[PDB]
Amino acid sequence: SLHMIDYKEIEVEEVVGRGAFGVVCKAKWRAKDVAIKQIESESERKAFIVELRQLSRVNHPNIVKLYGACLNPVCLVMEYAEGGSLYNVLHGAEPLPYYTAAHAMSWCLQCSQGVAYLHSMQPKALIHRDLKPPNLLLVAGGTVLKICDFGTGSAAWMAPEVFEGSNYSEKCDVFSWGIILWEVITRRKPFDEIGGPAFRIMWAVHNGTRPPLIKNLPKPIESLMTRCWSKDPSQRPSMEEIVKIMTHLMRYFPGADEPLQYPCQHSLPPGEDGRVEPYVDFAEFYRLWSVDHGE
Ligand SMILES: Nc1ncnc2c1ncn2[C@@H]1O[C@H](CO)[C@@H](O)[C@H]1O
Incomplete structure (x- = not known):
């Protein structure tokens, strides 16, 4: 109105x-x-x-x-x-911006906040259905993230129960969130190594295929990421729980307020090993975490 x-x-x-x-x-x-x-x-x-x-x-x-x-x-x-799209920031043209682990975590936290608001709508919850980088916009120096274009979206971010036609809930948005988290941490396009028609990705994901594990990723972040990828929708956390968890982790990710202003010359060495290296650095996380706990 x-x-x-x-x-x-x-x-x-x-x-x-x-x-x-x-x-x-x-x-x-x-x-x-x-x-x-x-x-x-x-x-x-x-x-x-x-x-x-x-x-x-x-x-x-x-x-x-x-x-x-x-x-x-x-x-x-x-x-x-x-600020343009998150897709363009991540995989855009030549002068790509440098971003940190704090940015990556911050973008994901803000995404979950916007989606948790949709899921909590009354009379009934709005599902986004098409969460992916092309639909995430940046403002305030690439510092603030906003969601746009509700589905009501490639197969790389879709929850398997969605292609299989079968019923689905807001938990389908939680699956997409998990894939976007892997994507901002590694700065790689999910299932880019499959290509071909969309049905080849749907088949892979439908049989349990997920993006490769990340080398040295913090256990608390890895577990949150893989829970969102659960085949079983009921086993995925609610967007509200993701907001609470991400908010608590942000305590170990200071510097999300800094604008994107450095151009980076991003390499990217695939070589399908048994894992992938993160684009962002988690050395400061472990140090700040260690200070609050024991190590
Ligand atoms: N409000 C907006 N400001 C700038 N670009 C936008 C906006 N809404 C959508 N877009 C662009 O729309 C293209 C198609 O959705 C996206 O790649 C994205 O960059």
């Missing part, structure tokens, strides 16, 4: 991308920089309407803010994520 806008007051600019349906472009509105997604032929009409009703209910710090809409041509006027 909120704000209307007339297309004639919006100055469309360069296309910034295309998601599940419409097309997102850069733009201006009332001298404020905005981002807008419009339809490209009805059919997206139905979907766009659902997005409106949903987006009109949500109000949270970690979810893209909607400014208004319009059926003149029909489009959403959202806030412009200066």
Whole structure:
């Protein structure tokens, strides 16, 4: 429930991308920089309407803010994520930014906060259904993360019970969260070594295949990550529990407030061993952890 806008007051600019349906472009509105997604032929009409009703209910710090809409041509006027997508930060073009373990953990904590808010909606919970880096936006110097484009999304982040058509719950979003955590820690695309048609990934994941273990990952983070990957949905933690756990771990990950400002020359040596090395460094975590415990 909120704000209307007339297309004639919006100055469309360069296309910034295309998601599940419409097309997102850069733009201006009332001298404020905005981002807008419009339809490209009805059919997206139905979907766009659902997005409106949903987006009109949500109000949270970690979810893209909607400014208004319009059926003149029909489009959403959202806030412009200066920082771009998390996909582009991770796997984008040449000058890729350097990021730390604190950033990675912080992005994941903020993601779970936004999703925990959706899962706690009343009358009934909203499931995202399409959690993946292309749908995670960064602002405030790549410091603050926000979720966008609700499913209502490649097979690399989908919970197996979802492809198999079968019923599913908010626990499908918890599975995607687990994969995104592996992905920001290793800075590798999940199942990139499978490729081919999507059905080859679905088959692998359906038979129990998960992203390779990370070398030297902290036990408390590894256990949280693998629990989210559980075949059995009921065995995955709730998004609320993930928020509590991640919040407590952040105590050993200081520096999440620092903006992304250094360009890194990221290598990436695959060689399918029996594990992968993390992109981020956990040496400070262990030292700060050790200080609070025994080691
Ligand atoms: N508010 C926004 N600001 C900047 N880019 C956006 C926004 N919403 C969606 N996008 C872009 O939409 C493309 C298609 O969803 C994504 O790759 C993402 O970078």
